[PDB]
Design a protein around this nucleic acid. Structure first.
Ligand SMILES: [Mg+2]
Ligand SMILES: [Mg+2]
Ligand SMILES: [Mg+2]
Ligand SMILES: [Mg+2]
Lengths: 167, 98
RNA sequence: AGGUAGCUCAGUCGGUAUGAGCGUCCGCCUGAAAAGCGGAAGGUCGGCGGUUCGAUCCCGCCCCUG
């Protein structure tokens, strides 16, 4: 509604639950917090269990008037999925940022659809599976060009968050 | 029974049973045993009501001293184990907020 | 005059809170419910102090309602 981008980072800040609390940033400026309230606060205050809350400072959110000019390629897309193993406390957003930075312009869409822990993964690890949609602006993208972009995305995730391609 | 020998023996039996409890469930069983109605420390107090009047002050501050020593140990242990339980809940409930 | 379990209320005249109903939890019942039976968890006895070996119970002050 404000036409700004935000990032949510882990935080500890009463009255929020320290494992379920995000601090909200616009650029590098903090603008508030969100998440689940602290169980001790809920009990002391007579609140319902599981109560959640958000508070943002609207004055710290800069007013924006963007003028988009989207690139809309009509050429066919290539759909590929990639499964990456990382340490269990690596934020999924950081992995997706790494995948995007390496994939380059041919990547049109990235969506996480699976978060998996289990004995076939190992302890202190988790597996993230992303659906990727590749597309070129001037041609029918080949699977090899898409796979090369995918390989560069996997390499970027290796260098930035220690991602290991799932085997 | 109100002697400073059977009393201090019962405080010591209680203070080490409290020290050896690593669970709220274990500590609950310890509480009913060393502080409940059938405890030596609680029966020592119910005996103060049938005691001659000239013997209640000299033996009451003794029985009270024994009760307050085991009560202090249980209360500090209950808070310690509850905090450990509560802290463990917060870590177990962590999520990826991104 | 009263404040007693999460709420609504009996009760305790200095050393065992003796409790109910509701609510909650747990069984039975239902495919699952509501309701209905059955059982369990649940009490610094309004706060700060005094007195006393010991205070829900006595004394002082104060908060809360008729
Ligand atoms: Mg494909
Ligand atoms: Mg996976
Ligand atoms: Mg049935
Ligand atoms: Mg029972």
């Amino acid at each position: 509604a404000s036409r700004v981008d935000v990032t949510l980072r882990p935080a500890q800040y009463l009255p929020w639950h320290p494992g379920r609390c995000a601090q909200v940033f616009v650029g590098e400026s903090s603008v508030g917090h969100a998440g689940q309230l602290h169980p001790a606060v809920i009990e002391r205050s007579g609140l319902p269990k599981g109560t959640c809350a958000v508070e943002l400072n609207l004055d710290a959110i800069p007013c924006s008037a963007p003028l988009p000019a989207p690139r809309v390629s009509p050429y066919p897309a290539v759909f590929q999925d990639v499964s990456l193993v990382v340490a269990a406390d690596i934020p999924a957003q950081a992995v997706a940022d790494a995948v995007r930075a390496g994939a380059g312009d041919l990547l049109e869409d990235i969506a996480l659809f699976d978060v998996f822990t289990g004995p076939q993964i190992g302890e202190h690890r988790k597996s993230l599976t992303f659906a990727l949609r590749f597309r070129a602006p001037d041609r029918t993208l080949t699977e090899d060009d898409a796979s090369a972009a995918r390989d560069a995305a996997v390499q970027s995730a290796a260098e930035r968050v220690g991602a290991v391609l799932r085997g | 029974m109100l002697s400073p020998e059977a009393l201090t023996t019962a405080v010591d039996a209680a203070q080490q049973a409290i020290a050896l409890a690593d669970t709220l469930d274990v500590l609950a069983r310890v509480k009913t045993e060393h502080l409940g109605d059938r405890s030596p420390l609680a029966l020592a107090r119910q005996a103060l009501a049938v005691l001659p009047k000239e013997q209640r002050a000299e033996a009451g501050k003794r029985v009270n001293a024994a009760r307050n020593a085991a009560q202090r140990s249980y209360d500090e242990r209950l808070a310690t184990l509850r905090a450990e339980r509560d802290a463990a809940v917060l870590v177990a409930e962590g999520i990826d907020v991104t």
